[PDB]
Nucleic acid binder design. Structure first.
Ligand SMILES: [Mg+2]
Ligand SMILES: [Mg+2]
Ligand SMILES: [Mg+2]
Ligand SMILES: [Mg+2]
Ligand SMILES: [Mg+2]
Ligand SMILES: [Mg+2]
Ligand SMILES: [Mg+2]
Ligand SMILES: [Mg+2]
Ligand SMILES: [Mg+2]
Ligand SMILES: [Mg+2]
Ligand SMILES: [Mg+2]
Ligand SMILES: [Mg+2]
Ligand SMILES: [Mg+2]
Ligand SMILES: [Mg+2]
Ligand SMILES: [Mg+2]
Ligand SMILES: [Mg+2]
Ligand SMILES: [Mg+2]
Ligand SMILES: [Mg+2]
Ligand SMILES: [Mg+2]
Ligand SMILES: [Mg+2]
Ligand SMILES: [Mg+2]
Ligand SMILES: [Mg+2]
Ligand SMILES: [Mg+2]
Ligand SMILES: [Mg+2]
Ligand SMILES: [Mg+2]
Ligand SMILES: [Mg+2]
Ligand SMILES: [Mg+2]
Ligand SMILES: [Mg+2]
Ligand SMILES: [Mg+2]
Ligand SMILES: [Mg+2]
Ligand SMILES: [Mg+2]
Ligand SMILES: [Mg+2]
Ligand SMILES: [Mg+2]
Ligand SMILES: [Mg+2]
Ligand SMILES: [Mg+2]
Ligand SMILES: [Mg+2]
Ligand SMILES: [Mg+2]
Ligand SMILES: [Mg+2]
Ligand SMILES: [Mg+2]
Ligand SMILES: [Mg+2]
Ligand SMILES: [Mg+2]
Ligand SMILES: [Mg+2]
Lengths: 96, 50, 79, 64
RNA sequence: CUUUAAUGUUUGAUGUUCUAACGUUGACCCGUAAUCCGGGUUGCGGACAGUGUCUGGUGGGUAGUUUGACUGGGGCGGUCUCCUCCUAAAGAGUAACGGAGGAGCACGAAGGUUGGCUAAUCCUGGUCGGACAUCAGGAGGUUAGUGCAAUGGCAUAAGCCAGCUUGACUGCGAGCGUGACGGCGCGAGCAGGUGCGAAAGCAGGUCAUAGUGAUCCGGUGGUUCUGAAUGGAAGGGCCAUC
RNA sequence: GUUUAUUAAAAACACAGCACUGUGCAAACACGAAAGUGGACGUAUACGGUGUGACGCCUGCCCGGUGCCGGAAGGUUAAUUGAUGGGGUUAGCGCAAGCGAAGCUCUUGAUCGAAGCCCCGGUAAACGGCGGCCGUAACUAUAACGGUCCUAAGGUAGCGAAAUUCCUUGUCGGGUAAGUUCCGACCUGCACGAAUGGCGUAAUGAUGGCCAGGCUGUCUCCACCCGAGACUCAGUGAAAUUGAACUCGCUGUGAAGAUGCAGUGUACCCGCGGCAAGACGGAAAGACCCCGUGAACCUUUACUAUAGCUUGACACUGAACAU
RNA sequence: GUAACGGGGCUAAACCAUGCACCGAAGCUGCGGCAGCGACGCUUAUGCGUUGUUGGGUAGGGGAGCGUUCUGUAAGCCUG
RNA sequence: AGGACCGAACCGACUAAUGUUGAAAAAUUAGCGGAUGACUUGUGGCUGGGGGUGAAAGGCCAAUCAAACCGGGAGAUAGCUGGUUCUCCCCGAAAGCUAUUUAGGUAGCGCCUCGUGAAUUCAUCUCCGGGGGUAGAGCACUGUUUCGGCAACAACCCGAUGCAAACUGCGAAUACCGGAGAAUGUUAUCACGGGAGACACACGGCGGGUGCUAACGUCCGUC
RNA sequence: UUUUGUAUAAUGGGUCAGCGACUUAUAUUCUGUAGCAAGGUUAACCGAAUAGGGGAGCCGAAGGGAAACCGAGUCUUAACU
RNA sequence: CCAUAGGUUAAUGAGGCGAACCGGGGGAACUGAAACAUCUAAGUACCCCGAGGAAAAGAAAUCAACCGAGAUUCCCCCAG
C-alpha cells in the first residue's frame, strides 16, 4: 500500500461498509442440483445432508443453472421466476 | 468570508432542502425563491435563509 | 523577492485539426478564453461555458473563415 | 503463517465480476454546498480501480 | 396551600466541649539483670493528625520524544497551495533562489429570460459651470466598459438600462478533454417539474481561466436497508449536510 | 590550600568574613516503596540552602515582568451529591393515528464544592533593568552638557581605550637611536559600575604583561675537546608496510598536480654511508563541513507524562451543645 | 628544460585551385567455421546441405548447460 | 605561638631537553612547590550505576566514564558503506514526469525483458486537408526613440529614422495532427499479464534563461 | 568497487590453503507440467501407515446492490429508458 | 485473682539441590508505526514463589435459538 508518502489509495478513498450479517446464512442452489437432493422433495434442509448448502444456512434460492430434467418438487424454499419454470417444466412443483 | 451558509427548506412536509450562502450583514430578509422538491417530485416554495 | 509562481498545464488548443473522425462530440478545439479565436458554426456549436468549441453530429471538420471581419469559425460537415 | 489482509483496504474495495474491484468516489462528504450538484451527482456511483493502482489493491487484499 | 415564625424532628455549614477510636520520638511496670518490640498503667493530644481511594493545583526533580524541506555547501534571508503573461524554438507539455503581477473571495442579483441601449476622448456653442459636472451639435470610432491580476474575448455585444422571474432546478448522460493516481473539466441529448417570450428559442449561476483541504472520527435531517433469541431500541448502512 | 590520575595549577574551586532565607525539634532537610537513619545524643549564640569571598571606604535608583511573602472580600474552578427536563421499552387506551402510567433503563446536569488562578499589598545582598529623538552653542560647527517623548525607573560613588574599546597601533606624555607591548593621562564607556559585588589594598604567588643590573654560545658565527650511539667484525635478531614491478628527467596529456600515457632528453650492472624534495609516503573507514525523518547527555514559559509537595470528598471516624 | 608543428627536418615537406594514383579500420568483399529466424532440395518426426538475414553491451529479463557432496538404480560395475 | 620562615626524608608536579616501534600504555635527567598541617602514610571498613563520591574538572568510581564492567532481551535498528563465488546463448534500459518530513529512499507512469492476443496496426517518402504566430520583418496598436514641422518649456498631431521576452495592421522554414497511396521493414504497433532495473548523468551540435553570449558553470528544449 | 568519468595520486587486497553471503517454514498469485473435470480436492484423525478409509471443509461453475433483496440479470431512478 | 505472654522439654515435619515443561506474584526496551506520545514489541525477555509427573483446567448461574446441545483438555476446520 505504501507509495512514497502520499495518502495511499486505500486511504484517499472512502469506506462504504455494512455487511449483511444474514446473507452469510443464505445459500444459492442451482438447477444443476436437485437431481441429487436424494430423491424428490427438495426440503428446506436435505440439500445440507446432500452436502451442498451448510449446516448453518437458513434460506436459499433455486436459480437457473440450466438443468432439471427429473420431476422434482422443492419444499420450504424460494426460487426465481425463471427457475420456477424449468422446474415445473420438468414436472416439478413449488412449496412456498 | 462574512458569507454564512444557508439551508433552503421545502414548504412541503418533506425534509428535503437546498444549500447556499448569503451575506446576512446586509441582506437580513429571509430568502425564499421556490425550487424543485425531489421527494414530491414537484416544484414548490423553499424557505429558511438568514 | 516576489518574482515566481505560474499557472499549471491548462492545455487549451486544437485537438481536432481539420477533418477528423469527429465522434458524437470530440472537442475540435478547447482553446478557452475565446469566441473569435474559434467561432461555433455549422453542425458543430455548443461552445461550452469555457468557450470550448463543442462539435455535434459525427463527421469531418472544416475550419473555415466567413462573415464580416475575418472570424475563423469551425464546423463539421458530413463525411 | 496465513497472509494478513490490510483491513483498511478491505473496507474500500470489492472484487467485481472479475479482476476489477470498483470503489467509492472521493470528494463527497465534506464542504458540499460550494460543490456543483452535477459534480457530486457524478460521484455518488462507484468506479473500478484505474488499473494503474490496481496492482496495489491486489496486494492489500490477498484474500479478495 | 400559600410569606414569618415557636417548639418539635431531620439533615447540612461553621464553631466550642467531651473520650472512646487514633497519635505519643513523655513517665512508669512486666516480658527482661535489652537502646529494639509487645502487653499493661498514667499523662498529653484527640476525632484532629495521619493513611487508603478519588480529585484541582504545583511539578525539567525525573522520563520519553519532537523541534520540516528547498537551498549553486549549510546557515541567515526567502520560499512551500491556486490563477495570469514571458521564458517555451508558430500542436500539448518543459527547468532555474529566472523576469513581472495577482487568489483564500464577491454577488438573491452583480443569476435567468425578454425587451431596449452603446462608448472614451476632443472641438464648438451654452445661467450659475470653472482643468474637470448637466445641455446642444460636430469629429471620433471597440483608444470605453468588464466586481477584483493578467492573458484571450466581447457589438448577435459578456459592456448598459428596465419588466418579469428563480434553470444558482432534481435524476441521468452519447461523446470527449486532462491527469501516475486520487481526481478535475467540457458536454448535446433524455425524464420530471420551472421561468422568460407572441414565437423560434434560452436558462443545470456569473465572459472564461484563481477564490481551495483528501481520509478518518464524529454532529444534524431523512429512510420502515440492517439491527446478534423474538418485538422494539442503541448502533451500523444509504442519501443530504456541518 | 584544592583541581582536569595521562596536553589546562590558573585570573578557576576552597577559604575565614559578610548577607539573605528556611527550620520550635517527631526541626527544616536528606537516604529509604516502609521500618528505620543521618541532621544531633545538637535545639535558634543551633542546623540546612543560597550567593558574595580577608581587610579598608562603600554598596545608588527601579517591584512594571517572573519568583517568594502576606491578604483572601469578590470572580472562576475538581471529585462529590444529583435537581430538573428529554429519550427507549410497555400495561392500558384505541378498528386506526397516535397517547402513553408504573417499573427498569439511557441521557440531562440545578445544586454543594478547597487549594490554585484573577484580584489587593509587599519584596532586588530575589531572577532581573538602569533611557531614545536627539533639545538649545566663536566661520559651519558640534551637540559630551542636557530639552522634549516614553519608561518599572532611566546608571549615584568609584573606575574607564580596562582580563571589558568594534573603528584601533585612538590622542598626549614617559621609557628607546627606533616601543601595534608596557606605564601615566584624556573620556568619543561600539558594549564598566556597586555582594552573577564597585574602587582600593600591606603581605603572599612554579600566576599575566613591561623594564633594568648581573650573567652568559640565546645570538653575531661557530671552533676544539671528553663520553653514549652512528660506522666495522663476531653472536642473537624485530617493526610498520606490502595488487604486481623489468620502480629516470622534462614538456604536454589525462578524473583537471604522472616512474608507468605522447613526444623527447638522458642512462653500462649491483652495493655501502648520508639527506629528506616526491612515491598526494606510513598510521587512524576526517575529529572540521553537509547528510541520516541516526545516538547520546544537557536546557527551557517545546509536548506529553510522572516521584515529590499540596487541595478538597468518602473511609478508618464517635458523643453533645450554641448559631 | 627545447616546451604554442608529436620530433627530425622542410622554402616547399606551407598555402590556393584542378586532377590522377596510392596507404589507411575489427567498415565492405573474398574463403573456411558456429548459433537464432525466414526460404529451397527437401527430405518428408525429425533432420541436414543451399541460401536471405541476425549475433558490442552495464542495470536487468529470458534460455541452455558443466562440475561438486549426499539418495535410489548398487549384493551391480570398477578396484591391491 | 604559627594552615610562620630555610631545607632532607615524605608528599607534590611549574619548566626544559630526551624519550614517542620508549627502560616506561606519562617515565628519566636537570631545575621546581609543600614540608606541624585543610599534612602524610599502613591495615580494615562504608557509600554501586541515572547511582556513588566530588575544596567542582564532568573530575574519579580497577590502563574503561556526558552514565562502569559482565551476562541476557539480541541475529536491536542500519532508506548507509562494503561484499556476493561455475560456463555458454538471446534481448536489452534509465539517470525522466508526478507525489512524497521527499531530495543519495520510495511509489504510479515512462524506458528494458518474457508470455499471450489482435490489425496493412506502426514507420519512412509522395500527395491531400488543417490550426499556428516562432525566425524574420514591421511600427497601426502597447511602450520606447530621435529629426524636422502649426505650442508667452514642452505633450498631442503630421512627415522622415530606429528599438521590443512579457508590441503585432504581416509572416516562413518547420514541427505536429488527420486522410490516401507504393515500396521497404524477421510487427517495427497496440492491449493485457510474470520479472525488472532506473528516478546522481556527462560531453558535443542547435534554440534559449542565468552567468560576463565567463567557467570541464548552471537550468531547460532537442539530436 | 564506486562513479558522468578512474592508469588514476579514489576504495579494497602482502601471498597461499581452508571457510565465507538470496536460505528455510507457512501463506498468496502467476508460468511450466501431470492428474481429473463442471467438477477438483480432502484436513485432522482411524490405519490392515507412503495404502485404504475420512469430503469437516476449501476453490469453481452467477452475478448486481450498501443492504433487504432480485437473479442472467441487477443496481441506479418516480422512469417499465 | 484469674488468664494469657513468655520459658523448658519431647515427638513429628520443613530447610538445600536440580534440564525442561506447569501454575502464580512482578514486569522492560531496542523494534514496528518508514518521525512519535495512543498503539506495537508483549504479558515477550528478565526477577521472584510454589508444585507434579505432568501442571492447569473441569461437571453450566455454559451455549444455542423456540430445534436443541450438554464438564475440562488437545488437534483440524470455521477465518485472516
Ligand atoms: Mg459439507
Ligand atoms: Mg529531558
Ligand atoms: Mg524510542
Ligand atoms: Mg535541508
Ligand atoms: Mg506552445
Ligand atoms: Mg463647454
Ligand atoms: Mg470573471
Ligand atoms: Mg600555593
Ligand atoms: Mg592534566
Ligand atoms: Mg600540568
Ligand atoms: Mg566569586
Ligand atoms: Mg545593589
Ligand atoms: Mg629591550
Ligand atoms: Mg593605561
Ligand atoms: Mg561586570
Ligand atoms: Mg570579586
Ligand atoms: Mg649498530
Ligand atoms: Mg651484526
Ligand atoms: Mg605533468
Ligand atoms: Mg632521518
Ligand atoms: Mg599520508
Ligand atoms: Mg569517513
Ligand atoms: Mg588500394
Ligand atoms: Mg583490414
Ligand atoms: Mg550479445
Ligand atoms: Mg609552613
Ligand atoms: Mg620548605
Ligand atoms: Mg586501604
Ligand atoms: Mg580509570
Ligand atoms: Mg527482540
Ligand atoms: Mg547486528
Ligand atoms: Mg507530508
Ligand atoms: Mg525578431
Ligand atoms: Mg513547437
Ligand atoms: Mg530522486
Ligand atoms: Mg535527478
Ligand atoms: Mg539534463
Ligand atoms: Mg557541465
Ligand atoms: Mg566525483
Ligand atoms: Mg589505486
Ligand atoms: Mg582462498
Ligand atoms: Mg519508529
Amino acid at each position: 500500500g505504501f507509495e512514497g508518502g502520499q495518502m495511499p489509495l486505500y486511504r484517499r478513498l472512502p469506506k462504504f461498509g455494512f455487511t449483511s450479517r444474514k446473507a452469510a446464512i443464505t445459500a444459492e442452489i442451482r438447477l444443476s442440483d436437485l437431481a441429487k437432493v436424494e430423491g424428490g422433495v427438495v426440503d428446506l434442509n436435505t440439500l445440507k445432508a446432500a452436502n451442498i448448502i451448510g449446516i448453518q444456512i437458513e434460506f436459499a434460492k433455486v436459480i437457473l443453472a440450466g438443468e432439471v430434467t427429473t420431476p422434482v418438487t422443492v419444499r420450504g424454499l424460494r426460487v426465481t421466476k425463471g427457475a420456477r419454470a424449468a422446474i415445473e417444466a420438468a414436472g416439478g412443483k413449488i412449496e412456498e | 468570508g462574512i458569507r454564512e451558509k444557508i439551508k433552503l427548506v421545502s414548504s412541503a412536509g418533506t425534509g428535503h432542502f437546498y444549500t447556499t450562502t448569503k451575506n446576512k450583514r446586509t441582506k437580513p430578509e429571509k430568502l425564499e425563491l421556490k425550487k424543485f422538491d425531489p421527494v414530491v417530485r414537484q416544484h414548490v416554495i423553499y424557505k429558511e435563509a438568514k | 523577492g516576489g518574482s515566481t509562481r505560474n499557472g499549471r498545464d491548462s492545455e487549451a488548443k486544437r485537438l481536432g485539426v481539420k477533418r477528423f473522425g469527429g465522434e458524437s462530440v470530440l472537442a475540435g478545439s478547447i482553446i478557452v478564453r475565446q469566441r473569435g479565436t474559434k467561432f461555433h458554426a455549422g453542425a458543430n456549436v455548443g461552445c461550452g461555458r469555457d468557450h470550448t468549441l463543442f462539435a455535434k453530429a459525427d463527421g469531418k471538420v472544416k475550419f473555415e473563415v466567413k462573415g464580416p471581419k475575418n472570424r475563423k469559425f469551425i464546423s463539421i460537415e458530413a463525411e | 503463517p496465513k497472509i494478513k489482509t490490510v483491513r483498511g483496504a478491505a473496507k474500500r474495495f470489492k472484487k467485481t465480476g472479475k479482476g476489477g474491484f470498483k470503489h467509492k468516489h472521493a470528494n463527497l462528504r465534506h464542504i458540499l454546498t460550494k460543490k456543483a450538484t452535477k459534480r457530486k451527482r457524478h460521484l455518488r456511483p462507484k468506479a473500478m480501480v484505474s488499473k494503474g493502482d490496481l496492482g496495489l489493491v491486489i496486494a492489500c487484499l490477498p484474500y479478495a
